[PDB]
Amino acid sequence: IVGGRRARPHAWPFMVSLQLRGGHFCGATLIAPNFVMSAAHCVANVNVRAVRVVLGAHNLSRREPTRQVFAVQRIFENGYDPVNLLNDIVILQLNGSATINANVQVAQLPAQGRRLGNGVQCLAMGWGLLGRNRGIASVLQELNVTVVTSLCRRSNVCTLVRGRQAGVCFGDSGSPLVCNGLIHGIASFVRGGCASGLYPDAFAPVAQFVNWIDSIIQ
Ligand SMILES: *[C@@H]1O[C@H](CO[C@@H]2O[C@@H](C)[C@@H](O)[C@@H](O)[C@@H]2O)[C@@H](O[C@@H]2O[C@H](CO)[C@@H](O)[C@H](O)[C@H]2NC(C)=O)[C@H](O)[C@H]1NC(C)=O
Ligand SMILES: CC1=C(C(=O)OCCO)[C@@H](c2ccc(C#N)cc2)NC(=O)N1c1cccc(C(F)(F)F)c1
Ligand SMILES: *[C@@H]1O[C@H](CO)[C@@H](O)[C@H](O)[C@H]1NC(C)=O
Secondary structure, three states, rough: EEEEEEEEOOOOOEEEEEEEEEEEEEEEEEEEEEEEEEEHHHOOOOOHOOOOOEEEEOOOOOOOOOOEEEEEEEEEEEOEEEEEEEHHHOOEEOOOOOOOOOEEEEEEEEOOOOOOOOOOOEEEEEOOOOOOOOOOOOEEEEEEEEOOOOOOOOEEEEEEOOOOOOOOOOOOOOOOEEEEOOEEEEEEEEEOOOOOOOOEEEEHHHHHHHHHHHHHHH
8 A cells, every 4th residue: 555554453354464475465355254355366376275364464564363364265256357357356265264353353245236436435455565665564554545437447446546646556456445334346456556646546346246255155
């Protein structure tokens, strides 16, 4: 997240860090005790048996007792098309079930097909790059953003910060976009580099996939 701020510790207990031996590479959202959802592009060309699913985290630089770590048992995809940038969503079934507590909670999703109007106010978040050569965040970051339909496709939810350069960035992929308390987006792609101040950020539209999500987690 470029131009954001530190989240209050465990403000967003559905927030997940996906990690390899090397550490954080993508976000995800806890959608049931034994399922997280993320961007398909996070796991294309990754060894999924090596992925650690880290719940309950805040400061990735410290050891945190609040954390629960799982492995990935199964992957569900839904037509990921990297060439057209479509269907950038994947569900990862965990090798166990999370212990739901103050720090680890499942997110609420929208109704199937629910679109967001121009001007809806959301929060983006992630442990991604803070900006040019500032590296990934240690502490979870959040950012006020605004839904825009201009310079966006119908197959995405797009957001833009007006009046300054701020937005999601590498490492934020797969992270939730929270709008009116519901997970309406999964961070998918940027244009013109991160925080261009020109192109809106693009998210997979969670509302378009709710029936499919339910078929799997329910
Ligand atoms: C900056 O964003 C915060 C948080 O956004 C809200 O909560 C998110 C989880 C998500 O649901 C968004 O869609 C929401 O808009 C805003 O904080 C809220 O502000 C209102 C009005 O001042 C306040 O009454 C609420 O209690 C706040 N909600 C929460 C959850 O803290 C804030 O307004 C945004 N600021 C700007 C200028 O856009
Ligand atoms: C991170 C990545 C790509 C990437 O790994 O592709 C490699 C795939 O092999 C590539 C991309 C290609 C296809 C899709 C789709 N469907 C999505 C993204 N384009 C891209 O913009 N990012 C990127 C950069 C900064 C922030 C974010 C965000 F998710 F928004 F947080 C994403
Ligand atoms: C799930 O994977 C984690 C991380 O490797 C491991 O600690 C734990 O034993 C596993 N839980 C199971 C198999 O129930």
